[PDB]
């Protein structure tokens, strides 16, 4: 679900 | 913003290792950065646009031969196109 090969910005996205 | 924070310390810590380390940038960080570039134009925060674009371009410029040179040309294209339609000018970083 998204990320393709492990998001670098989208991992550090507005999400906690 | 950049991902979740408008802090240039966060922006910088995203962009720096992204451009230098990731062998093949997936479209999802590429679409998030282009989104904010065009959004910083419309949100009157071309101050932060200055910071984001100058740092992004500088690293993608000094990268020899990678996808980052095409990403340089792509992101910088779309931001200046919105900026010439909105503000009527295209900021040349130089």
Curated annotation (Swiss-Prot), chain A:
Disease per UniProt entry: Immunodeficiency 122: An autosomal recessive, severe immunologic disorder characterized by recurrent viral and bacterial infections of the respiratory tract and skin, appearing in early infancy. Additional clinical features include poor overall growth, global developmental delay with poor motor skills, impaired intellectual development, and poor or absent speech acquisition. Some patients have diffuse skin rash, erythroderma, sensorineural hearing loss, lymphadenopathy, dysmorphic facial features, and tooth abnormalities. Death in early childhood may occur.
Post-translational modification: Ubiquitinated, but not targeted to the proteasome. Sumoylated. Sumoylation with SUMO3 may be predominant.
Subcellular locations according to the entry: Cytoplasm; Nucleus
Superkingdom of origin organism: Eukaryota
Role: Accessory component of both the DNA polymerase delta complex and the DNA polymerase zeta complex. As a component of the trimeric and tetrameric DNA polymerase delta complexes (Pol-delta3 and Pol-delta4, respectively), plays a role in high fidelity genome replication, including in lagging strand synthesis, and repair. Required for optimal Pol-delta activity. Stabilizes the Pol-delta complex and plays a major role in Pol-delta stimulation by PCNA. Pol-delta3 and Pol-delta4 are characterized by the absence or the presence of POLD4. They exhibit differences in catalytic activity.
Domain characteristics, as noted in the entry: The PIP-box mediates the interaction with PCNA.
Stated name of the protein: DNA polymerase delta subunit 3
Subunit organization: Component of both the DNA polymerase delta and DNA polymerase zeta complexes. The tetrameric DNA polymerase delta complex (Pol-delta4), which consists of POLD1/p125, POLD2/p50, POLD3/p66/p68 and POLD4/p12, with POLD1 bearing DNA polymerase and 3' to 5' proofreading exonuclease activities. Within this complex, directly interacts with POLD2. Following stress caused by DNA damaging agents or by replication stress, POLD4 is degraded and Pol-delta4 is converted into a trimeric form of the complex (Pol-delta3), which consists of POLD1, POLD2 and POLD3.
UniProtKB/Swiss-Prot annotation, chain B:
Reported tissue expression: Ubiquitous.
UniProt subcellular location: Nucleus
Origin: domain of life: Eukaryota
Chain segments carrying region Protein interaction domain: 1-92
Subunit structure: Monomer. Interacts with the DNA polymerase zeta which is composed of REV3L and MAD2L2; the interaction with MAD2L2 is direct and requires that REV3L is in its closed conformation. Interacts with POLH, POLI and POLK. May bind ITGA3. Interacts with FAAP20/C1orf86.
Domain notes: The C-terminal domain is necessary for protein interactions.
Role noted for this protein: Deoxycytidyl transferase involved in DNA repair. Transfers a dCMP residue from dCTP to the 3'-end of a DNA primer in a template-dependent reaction. May assist in the first step in the bypass of abasic lesions by the insertion of a nucleotide opposite the lesion. Required for normal induction of mutations by physical and chemical agents.
Family to which this protein belongs: Belongs to the DNA polymerase type-Y family.
Protein name as annotated: DNA repair protein REV1
Lineage: Eukaryota, Metazoa, Chordata, Craniata, Vertebrata
The encoding gene: REV1
Shown residues within the full chain: 1158 to 1251 of 1251
């Amino acid at each position: 679900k998204g990320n393709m090969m492990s998001n670098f910005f989208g991992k550090a996205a507005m999400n906690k | 913003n950049l991902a979740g924070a408008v802090e240039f310390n966060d922006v910088k810590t995203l962009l720096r290792e992204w451009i230098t380390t990731i062998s093949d940038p997936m479209e999802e960080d590429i679409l998030q950065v282009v989104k904010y570039c065009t959004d910083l134009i419309e949100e009157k925060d071309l101050e932060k646009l200055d910071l984001v674009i100058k740092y992004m371009k500088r690293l993608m410029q000094q990268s020899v031969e990678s996808v980052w040179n095409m990403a340089f040309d792509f992101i910088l294209d779309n931001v200046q196109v919105v900026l010439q339609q909105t503000y009527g000018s295209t900021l040349k970083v130089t």
